[PDB]
Coordinates of all heavy atoms in Angstrom, one line a residue:
Chain A
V60 N 40.9 5.0 172.9 CA 40.3 6.4 172.8 C 39.3 6.6 171.7 O 39.3 5.8 170.6 CB 41.4 7.5 172.8 CG1 42.2 7.5 174.0 CG2 42.3 7.4 171.5
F92 N 44.4 19.9 176.5 CA 45.6 19.1 176.5 C 45.4 17.6 176.2 O 46.0 16.9 175.4 CB 46.4 19.3 177.8 CG 47.6 18.5 178.0 CD1 48.8 18.9 177.4 CD2 47.6 17.3 178.7 CE1 50.0 18.2 177.4 CE2 48.8 16.5 178.7 CZ 50.0 17.0 178.2
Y93 N 44.4 17.0 176.9 CA 44.0 15.7 176.6 C 43.7 15.4 175.2 O 44.2 14.5 174.6 CB 42.7 15.3 177.5 CG 42.3 13.8 177.3 CD1 43.2 12.8 177.6 CD2 41.0 13.5 176.8 CE1 42.8 11.4 177.5 CE2 40.7 12.2 176.6 CZ 41.6 11.1 177.0 OH 41.3 9.8 176.9
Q94 N 42.8 16.3 174.6 CA 42.5 16.1 173.2 C 43.7 16.1 172.3 O 43.8 15.4 171.4 CB 41.3 17.1 172.8 CG 40.0 16.9 173.4 CD 39.4 15.5 173.1 OE1 39.6 15.0 171.9 NE2 38.7 14.8 174.0
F95 N 44.6 17.0 172.6 CA 45.9 17.1 171.9 C 46.7 15.9 172.0 O 47.2 15.3 171.0 CB 46.7 18.4 172.2 CG 48.0 18.6 171.5 CD1 48.0 18.8 170.1 CD2 49.2 18.5 172.2 CE1 49.2 18.9 169.4 CE2 50.3 18.6 171.5 CZ 50.4 18.8 170.1
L96 N 46.9 15.4 173.2 CA 47.6 14.2 173.5 C 47.1 13.0 172.7 O 47.8 12.2 172.2 CB 47.7 13.9 175.0 CG 48.7 12.8 175.4 CD1 49.2 13.1 176.8 CD2 48.0 11.4 175.4
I97 N 45.7 12.8 172.7 CA 45.2 11.6 172.1 C 45.3 11.7 170.6 O 45.2 10.7 169.9 CB 43.8 11.2 172.6 CG1 42.7 12.2 172.1 CG2 43.8 10.9 174.1 CD1 41.3 12.0 172.7
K98 N 45.3 13.0 170.1 CA 45.5 13.2 168.7 C 46.9 12.8 168.2 O 47.0 12.1 167.2 CB 45.2 14.7 168.3 CG 45.3 14.9 166.8 CD 44.8 16.4 166.4 CE 45.8 17.4 166.9 NZ 45.3 18.8 166.9
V99 N 47.9 13.2 168.9 CA 49.3 12.8 168.5 C 49.8 11.4 169.0 O 50.5 10.8 168.3 CB 50.3 13.9 169.1 CG1 49.9 15.4 168.7 CG2 50.6 13.8 170.5
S100 N 49.3 11.0 170.1 CA 49.7 9.8 170.8 C 48.6 8.9 171.2 O 48.4 8.6 172.4 CB 50.6 10.1 172.0 OG 51.7 10.9 171.6
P101 N 47.8 8.4 170.2 CA 46.6 7.6 170.7 C 47.0 6.3 171.3 O 46.1 5.8 172.1 CB 45.8 7.5 169.4 CG 46.8 7.6 168.2 CD 47.8 8.6 168.8
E120 N 56.6 13.0 170.0 CA 55.5 13.0 169.0 C 54.8 14.3 169.0 O 54.4 14.7 167.9 CB 54.5 11.7 169.3 CG 55.3 10.4 169.0 CD 54.5 9.2 169.4 OE1 53.4 9.3 170.0 OE2 55.0 8.1 169.2
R123 N 57.1 16.4 166.9 CA 56.9 16.0 165.5 C 55.7 16.7 164.9 O 55.8 17.2 163.8 CB 56.8 14.5 165.3 CG 56.4 14.0 164.0 CD 56.5 12.4 164.0 NE 55.2 11.8 164.5 CZ 55.2 10.6 164.9 NH1 56.2 9.7 164.8 NH2 54.0 10.1 165.5
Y124 N 54.6 16.7 165.6 CA 53.4 17.4 165.2 C 53.7 18.8 164.9 O 53.2 19.3 163.9 CB 52.3 17.2 166.2 CG 50.9 17.6 165.7 CD1 50.1 16.7 165.2 CD2 50.5 19.0 165.8 CE1 48.8 17.1 164.6 CE2 49.3 19.4 165.3 CZ 48.5 18.4 164.7 OH 47.2 18.8 164.2
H128 N 53.0 20.7 161.3 CA 51.9 21.7 161.2 C 52.2 23.0 161.8 O 51.4 24.0 161.6 CB 50.7 21.1 162.0 CG 50.4 19.7 161.4 ND1 49.7 19.4 160.3 CD2 50.8 18.4 162.0 CE1 49.6 18.1 160.1 NE2 50.2 17.5 161.2
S132 N 50.0 25.7 165.8 CA 49.0 24.7 165.7 C 48.7 24.0 167.0 O 47.6 23.4 167.2 CB 49.5 23.7 164.7 OG 50.6 23.0 165.1
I133 N 49.6 24.1 167.9 CA 49.6 23.3 169.2 C 49.2 24.2 170.4 O 49.6 25.4 170.5 CB 50.8 22.5 169.4 CG1 52.0 23.3 170.0 CG2 51.3 21.8 168.1 CD1 53.0 22.5 170.8
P134 N 48.4 23.7 171.3 CA 47.9 24.5 172.4 C 49.2 25.0 173.2 O 50.1 24.3 173.4 CB 47.2 23.4 173.3 CG 46.7 22.4 172.3 CD 47.9 22.3 171.4

Side-chain angles (χ1 to χ4, degrees):
Chain A
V60 296
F92 180 78
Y93 182 62
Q94 291 299 324
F95 180 64
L96 192 150
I97 67 186
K98 185 173 71 196
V99 313
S100 296
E120 293 173 0
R123 167 176 84 195
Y124 193 94
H128 308 281
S132 65
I133 82 159

